[PDB]
Amino acid sequence: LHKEPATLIKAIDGDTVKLMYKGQPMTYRLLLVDTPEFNEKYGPEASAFTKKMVENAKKIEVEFDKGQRTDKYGRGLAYIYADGKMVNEALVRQGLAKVAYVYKGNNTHEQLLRKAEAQAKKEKLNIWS
Numbered sequence: 493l494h495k496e497p498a499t500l501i502k503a504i505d506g507d508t509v510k511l512m513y514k515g516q517p518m519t520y521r522l523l524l525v526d527t528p529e530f531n532e533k534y535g536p537e538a539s540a541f542t543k544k545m546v547e548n549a550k551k552i553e554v555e556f557d558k559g560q561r562t563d564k565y566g567r568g569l570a571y572i573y574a575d576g577k578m579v580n581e582a583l584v585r586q587g588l589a590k591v592a593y594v595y596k597g598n599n600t601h602e603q604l605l606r607k608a609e610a611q612a613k614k615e616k617l618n619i620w621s
């Protein structure tokens with residue numbers, strides 16, 4: 493897997509962000525996670541977590557997995573990094589996201605995220621409380 497350059501266009505919600513990649517705007521869906529919808533519990537906190545994390549980052553990187561970089565709604569599917577910290581793993585670690593949507597061929601960081609979910613669950617953080 494390789495990290496590639498991108499720049500924040502706009503925060504959207506817990507697990508989607510509008511980025512500019514190779515000079516084009518694109519909405520990205522965070523791989524292997526599921527944040528609550530805004531109007532669900534911890535939804536607003538998930539949005540705020542992700543928003544602050546991307547908005548404060550001096551360096552935004554996009555990391556595709558091995559299969560299909562686009563979803564059926566045309567959203568980019570990627571791992572996103574804010575100054576070298578993975579937003580996908582960061583939400584799960586805080587129990588603001590669940591490991592979810594684990595499709596074979598786009599699952600490189602699955603065990604890494606499940607590790608973070610185990611610890612979040614262990615600490616009864618947010619979603620697990």
Ligand SMILES: Cc1cn([C@H]2C[C@H](OP(=O)(O)O)[C@@H](COP(=O)(O)O)O2)c(=O)[nH]c1=O
Nearest residue numbers: 521522523524525526563564569593595598
């Ligand atoms: C995370 C992810 C979601 N999706 C699709 C499956 C879901 O389809 P359905 O709409 O048919 O449920 C939807 C969930 O996204 P949201 O959690 O953003 O709603 O996005 C993928 O196809 N691949 C993925 O890696």
Ligand SMILES: [Ca+2]
Nearest residue numbers: 507526527528
């Ligand atoms: Ca979601």
